[PDB]
A paper describes a structure:
Adeno-associated viruses (AAVs) belong to the Dependoparvovirus genus within the Parvoviridae family. To dissect the divergent rules of engagements between multiple AAV serotypes with AAVR, we select two AAV serotypes, AAV1 and AAV5, and solve the atomic structures of their complexes with AAVR by cryo-EM.
The AAVR PKD1 polypeptide spanning residues from AAVRV305 to AAVRE401 was built into the density and refined. The PKD1 residues in strands F/G and the CD loop interact with the AAV5 capsomers to form a major fulcrum. However, the structures of AAV5 capsomers with and without PKD1 attached display strict structural homology with an r.m.s.d of 0.27 Å for all Cɑ atoms from 519 residues, indicating that no obvious structural shift occurs upon AAVR binding.
Numbering used by the authors:
A (entry chain A), B (entry chain A), C (entry chain A): 209 to 724
C-alpha cells in the first residue's frame, strides 16, 4: 500500500498435483529508460549483401516481459520428472504479477554517479489483450526470464518492423505506426502492483513420446498380405505378380505416409569429413517472399536431422542454442564445442531425414522402345494420408508462438517447436514515465531533457500445465534422461566457482516410447 | 391475387444494422422460350485443337436465376462502406421472391410482330434444394443479375455437360440425363408469386484485410535469437556456427511458412518488354484430368501475381473482367485498355509470387569430393505449418461455389474466390409452360407446334451479411478505396450520355490493414 | 493517499460507442515557478510601428491547462475515422483530472544543480467556473497538450491584458487587477489529486460535410421557370422580357444568397506570379477598434480562399499552422515549405471567394440621356435570406472559444473555427506554493527569497462527443482522407530517427458530401 510495505512475496516453486502441475517463478528485473523516452525510426538496407535484412520499423521506450521459454518456469529436475513420466503436456492458465517496483535515479555529477531512489516516480504497465500491437514475443529473441532464479535480467526494448518498400529502408503507404501511450496503462508507484490472469485456449498436447515402431513396418512379420505387387514383365509385355510376403516391408502395401520434406544439406559434426572452407550462405534453402529471399531455419515440420548415432546433422534443420547467454551484437565464430546442437533422432521412424532424397517417381511412359525410368525428388509437401511428428520442445526453447492474422493457414505447428496459439499470452509492455529536468520557461517544443533514471522490481509468473499420463504395457525398461557424466569437473545445471549458470546439453521431451 | 393487382413491390435497398447488413435488390427479367420447349443433345469434339473442349451434355428449355456475383446485391457505395470499415463478412440468410409475372405472345403475321399478353398462360418455377441436378451456378458464367438496378437482363438457358467417352462427343454408360419436369414445380399465373428462403451454413469470414507485417519478418529487429545457424566449415570438415542476429531476417529461424505455389508465366502490362508474337496457349500451366489436359486459371490459393507497383502480372493467376458485358460467342482480341486486370498485390507478405521460384533444396549429399549443390523448384504443395491468404473477392466477382460431391477434399476455398459452400443456395429453375398451337387431329407423336411466347417479371433477392468489425490500435491513417480520378471525363460506376453503366476499375476488399 | 501510492492511472484511449465517442488523453506536464512567485505589470507601447500592439496588463505566477486543440484528444486515426464517417460532432461532457503531483527543488550550489523532491511542498489548483477571470484559453495561443502522448509539455504562464489608455502602455481608471489567490484553490500534496467535471451547453453540430451542389444551381436543368427576366429595351423605352430557361443558372431567380464577404488579397503559392518584395503589412484588411487599427485574420465566416486546384490563396483569410512547435519569440521568416497553409476549397459552392468581388449593383438611375451603370463592391454583410458555411475545424486547431460578455452578438461562430461557447470549459489555473528560504528576522516587508522549485505530474482529460451519423443515398464512392504519399521518406503523424513528431499536412473535416 505504501513505500515501507512489501507489495508481494517471492513465489518460486512447483506443485505436481496428479495430471496437473503449477510452476511459479519469481525473477528480478531491471528496466533502463530506453531511447531517452522517445519513439525512433529504425531502418536498414541490405547488410551482408542481402536485401532480406532491409527493414523499416519503430523502436519504443517500452520494455516487455518475455517468459516464452521453458526454463523460465521449469527447473531441470522438474523438467526431468516431466519428460520421463508423461506422454504429453500443454499449458492451461497463466498468472503474471509485477511487484516491488522501485525506481532509482542516476545523477552523474563530476563523474560521481550517485544512485538514489525517488519515491514519487511511476511506472506504466499495460497488457495487450486485444492483440492490436505487433506481437514480437514468440520469435526466438533474447531478453527472457533467466533459467536460474537468482539471476537478474534486463527487460528487452520493444521494437517492431513494419512494411518497407521494394526491399529498401523506405516505408510504403501501408506501413503503420503504433503509439503505445494510446493504450490505457496502469501507473505504478513503489507501493502498487500489477496482476494479470490468462487462460490458454484449447491446444493439442505436445506428443512427448518417441515411436516404438517404424511407420513402414506396422504389419506383423509373421502373416503375409492378401495383396499382390507388380514385379516384372515376361519376354512379351505380359505383366507378372508376386505375393507380398510376411516381413518384406520394402514392398508391402502401405496405408500411411511420412510428412513433408525439403532436402537440406547435411554436415558432419564430431570427427567430420566436411567440405573445407565453405561459405555456407549461398547454398542454403531459401524461401523468397515478396522480393528478397530469406533463409528459413528450421524447415517446416515433418523431417529430422541426425538418423541415429551418426555425426551427420542437417544444420539448416536444427535448433542451435548456446551454452551461456552472449553479448549482444557479437560476430564471434563459435565452434561445435560452444553450441547446443540439438538432435531430432527420436522421431526418425515417422519423419524422413533432411539430407537424403525422400523417394522417386516415374519420369516417362514405358513402351516396347522406352524402358521405365524414375527420378528422385528433393521435396514433397502434404499428401492426403500423411503422418509426421511435431518439433520437439526443449528446456531451452520457446513455449508458444502466435499464428499470423492472415486469412487462412494449414495446421499451425510452429517450425521452431512449441504451441501454435491464435490468442497467445498478451504482451506485457512496461516503461518508466518521463520525469522532466529543470525547465524554467515555456516553449511549444516538447521537453527533451529528462531525469535519467531506471526502475527495478520483481515479477512472478504462475503457469499451469495439464499433463497426459503414461499408460503402456511395455515390459522392458525405457531410456530416460539420466544424469550421466563420466568424470564431472562441475555439476551441470548448477553454478561454478565463478558463479555463472552452467548448462552443457539440451534436454528433449521424447524419452517415453509408444507404438504407432 | 388477380391480374389487376400487383403481386409484390420493388424492394431494392440496404440497411446497415451494427455488425449486420441486409441487401435487397429487385431486377426485371425476360425469359425466352428456349429450345422451343424441348430437351436437346448438345455435344462437341476437339475445337481449337484441344480435346479438353469435347463435351457431351443436354440443354433444357429451363432458364435459371444466377445472383452469384457481388454487384447483384451491392451498390459501389455500400461496397465502399464495407471494405473500408470491416475486417470480414459472410452471408447468413437469403430470400428470393419472383413476382409480377406477365407472359406475352409474339405473333408474326405478314412481318407485323404483334406482341400481346395472354392472361391464362403459366410459368413453372422450382428450386433444387436437395441438390439433385448439376449445379452450374458457381462457375463464372454470364446471365447474372445486372450491377445497375434499372437494367433488364435475360435469363440464361440451363444446360449441363455430363460424362463423355474417350475425349469425344459420344457418351459413356455412366452419362446421365436429368429431366427437370420430373421435379415438382409451382405453376405461376400473372397473379401468383414464388417466395423462397434459405439460411447459409457456417462458413469462415472472408479475410478482408491486408497484412501489416511480412511473414518471414515477424521477430523484432531489436533482440536476437537464442538459436544458431550453420554458416560454414573450416579447413577441415568441422562445422561452424553463428548467432542469428536481431534484424537479419534472411537467416533467422522461421516458425510459419507460405502457401502453395505453381510457377506461372509473368507478363508485363503497361509499357511492357513482353515477348512479341506469342501464341500463349501451348505454354500455360495445364492440369491433365482423365485423358485431356485443361488450362486451369486461376491456380489454387496461396500465390499472387503483381508484387507492388510493378507492371509484371501473372496473367494465368488472375481474374480478368471486362468493363462492359459482351455479346455472346465473340472472338474479339481485347487489349489491356478494355479489361479489368485484377491485382493480388495486397497479399504479398504472406503469399509467394507466381512468376518466381519459391525456394531451393539440396540436390546431392556433400563430401570431401562433392561440393553442396541446391536446385530451385517451381512448385510446392501444402507443408504442415503453412499459412496463406485466400483469394480476394471483388465487386464484379462470384460470391459462392459448390464443393463437388466427391469423397474427400482439402479445405475448400474456391480458386476463383468467394465462399466454398457444401449446400449452396439452391438453383432456381424457371421455364414457360408450352401452349400448343392449332392441333385439329389426334396423333401419337407429341406436339411440336407451339404458341411462340416469352414471359417477363421481377425478382427480388434479399441477402443478409454478418460482418467482422475492425478493431486496431494502428495510429496513422490507412489506405482506403477513395474516388480518385484525375480529370474525369465521366462519373464512374454511373451511366453516360448513351445510358450504359460505366465501370472502369475492379474493387477489392483488402484495404484495412492488420498485423500477423 | 500518501507518497508511496499512485494517485491515478494513465487513461489514454478512445471508445467509439454508436453515435458517441469518449476520448481520454493523459499527458505529463512541468510547472515552472513563474515570476518567482509574484504579480508583475507587463506593459508595452507601439512596437512594429503600430500602436495596436500597445497593451497594459498583469502576469501571474499561475500556470494553466490549455486542452483547447483537437489533437490533444484525437489521434490521427481516430480523427480519420470521424471525418470519413460522420456528418457532424459536438462535445457533450468533459472530465479533467490532475494527478501524481511531485514537486522537485533545484539547488544550484557551486554550479552543481542538485534536483531533489520535497515531500511537503504543495500545489494550488482552482478552476474558474463562475467566469470571473479573463478567459485567455480560446485565442490560439501555445502551451497546449501535445499531439503525441509521450511528449512532456510545460504549462503556459497566465497573463491578461486589461484596458490601456489612449493606445499607450498606461492604464485607465477602468483597468482592473484580478488577484488569483483571492479564489479558493485546493492545496495538493504529492498524494492528492484534483478531479473536475463539466457538461457542455447546447451547441450546434459542426457541419463536417462538403456541399454536393452549388447554391445558385439548385434548380433542375430540365424544366424551366415560370418567372421572366427583364432582358432589354426596344428602340423606344419599352421593356422586354424573356423566359428563364432550364439550365441557365446565370439568370434564373434565386431564393438563397451567399454569406458575408470582405475582399482580401490573393497570393499565389506553389509556382507563383506574386508581386516581388511586398511588405505585406500596410495593405491588409484592418478593423479599427477604439483608436488603433488591428489586423483581423481570419476574416469572419462566409468566405473561402482557394477555389479548386488553383495556387492562389487568400493568406489573410486562412489558418497557417507550422509543422512543428517553434521556439518562443522567434523572428524567423518561414516559407511555404515550413507551414501548413490550410484550404477552405470544400465550401466554395456556398461561400464566395475572398480575392474576388462579390457582385455589382446599380450606381445611377437610367434615362433617355444616361445609360445604366453598375459598380462592383468589395464587401457585403448579412442580407436576410443568406446562407454560408462555418469555418472548418482541423486536427491542429482550436475546439472552442468564449463569446465576450457584452450586451449583444450576432450568431457566435468563432472566426478561427470551432464552437462558440457562452460558458466554456473553466480555466484550470495552477501554481506552486511559495516556500520561503532562510529568513532569520522579522521584517514587515514581504519575503522575496524563496526555495526555487518546480512541480510536475500528469493530467488526464476525458471528453465526450455526440456524433451526427451519415445517411446518404449517393451511389458513387466519395473522397475520403486516405494516407496517400508518393515515395514516403518517413511515416507521417509518427516520429522519426530524431524522435520528434512529424506532421506534414493539416486534416479537415469536410470529406463527406451532402446536397443542399
Amino acid at each position: 500500500d505504501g513505500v515501507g510495505n512489501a507489495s508481494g512475496d517471492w513465489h518460486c516453486d512447483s506443485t505436481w498435483m496428479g495430471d496437473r502441475v503449477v510452476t511459479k517463478s519469481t525473477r528480478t528485473w531491471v528496466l533502463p529508460s530506453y531511447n531517452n523516452h522517445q519513439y525512433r525510426e529504425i531502418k536498414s538496407g541490405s547488410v551482408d549483401g542481402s536485401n532480406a535484412n532491409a527493414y523499416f520499423g519503430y523502436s519504443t521506450p517500452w520494455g516487455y516481459f518475455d517468459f516464452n521459454r521453458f526454463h523460465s518456469h521449469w527447473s531441470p529436475r522438474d523438467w526431468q520428472r516431466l519428460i520421463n513420466n508423461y506422454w504429453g503436456f500443454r499449458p492451461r492458465s497463466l498468472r503474471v504479477k509485477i511487484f516491488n517496483i522501485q525506481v532509482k535515479e542516476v545523477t552523474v555529477q563530476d563523474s560521481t554517479t550517485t544512485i538514489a531512489n525517488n519515491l514519487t516516480s511511476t511506472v506504466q504497465v499495460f497488457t495487450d489483450d486485444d492483440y492490436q500491437l505487433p506481437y514480437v514475443v514468440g520469435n526466438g529473441t533474447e531478453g527472457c526470464l533467466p533459467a536460474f532464479p537468482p539471476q537478474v535480467f534486463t527487460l528487452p526494448q520493444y521494437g517492431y518492423a513494419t512494411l518497407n518498400r521494394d526491399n529498401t529502408e523506405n516505408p510504403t503507404e501501408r506501413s503503420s505506426f503504433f503509439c503505445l501511450e494510446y493504450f490505457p496503462s496502469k501507473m505504478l508507484r513503489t507501493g502498487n502492483n500489477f496482476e494479470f490472469t490468462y487462460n490458454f485456449e484449447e491446444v493439442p498436447f505436445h506428443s512427448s513420446f518417441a515411436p516404438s515402431q517404424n511407420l513402414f513396418k506396422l504389419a506383423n512379420p509373421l502373416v503375409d498380405q492378401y495383396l499382390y505387387r507388380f514385379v516384372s514383365t515376361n519376354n512379351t509385355g505380359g505383366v507378372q505378380f508376386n505375393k507380398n510376403l510376411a516381413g518384406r516391408y520394402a514392398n508391402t502395401y502401405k496405408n500411411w505416409f511420412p510428412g513433408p520434406m525439403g532436402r537440406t544439406q547435411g554436415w558432419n559434426l564430431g570427427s567430420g569429413v566436411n567440405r573445407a572452407s565453405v561459405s555456407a550462405f549461398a547454398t542454403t534453402n531459401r524461401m523468397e517472399l515478396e522480393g528478397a529471399s530469406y533463409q528459413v531455419p528450421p524447415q517446416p515440420n515433418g523431417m529430422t536431422n541426425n538418423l541415429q548415432g551418426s555425426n551427420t546433422y542437417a544444420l539448416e534443420n536444427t535448433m542451435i542454442f548456446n551454452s551461456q547467454p552472449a553479448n549482444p551484437g557479437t560476430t564471434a565464430t563459435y565452434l561445435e564445442g560452444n553450441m547446443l546442437i540439438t538432435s531430432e533422432s527420436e522421431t526418425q521412424p515417422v519423419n524422413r531425414v533432411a539430407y537424403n532424397v525422400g523417394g522417386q517417381m516415374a519420369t516417362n511412359n514405358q513402351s516396347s522402345t522406352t524402358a521405365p525410368a524414375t527420378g528422385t525428388y528433393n521435396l514433397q509437401e502434404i499428401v492426403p494420408g500423411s503422418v509426421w511428428m511435431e518439433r520437439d520442445v526443449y528446456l531451452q526453447g520457446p513455449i508458444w508462438a502466435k499464428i499470423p492474422e492472415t486469412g487462412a493457414h494449414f495446421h499451425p505447428s510452429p517450425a521452431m517447436g512449441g504451441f501454435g496459439l491464435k490468442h497467445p499470452p498478451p504482451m506485457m509492455l512496461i516503461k518508466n514515465t518521463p520525469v522532466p529536468g529543470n525547465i524554467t520557461s515555456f516553449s511549444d517544443v516538447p521537453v527533451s531533457s529528462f531525469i535519467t533514471q531506471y526502475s527495478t522490481g520483481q515479477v512472478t509468473v504462475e503457469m499451469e500445465w495439464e499433463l497426459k499420463k503414461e499408460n503402456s504395457k511395455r515390459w522392458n525398461p525405457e531410456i530416460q534422461y539420466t544424469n550421466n557424466y563420466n568424470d564431472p569437473q562441475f555439476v551441470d545445471f548448477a553454478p561454478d566457482s565463478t558463479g555463472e549458470y552452467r548448462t552443457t546439453r539440451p534436454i528433449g521431451t521424447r524419452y517415453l516410447t509408444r507404438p504407432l
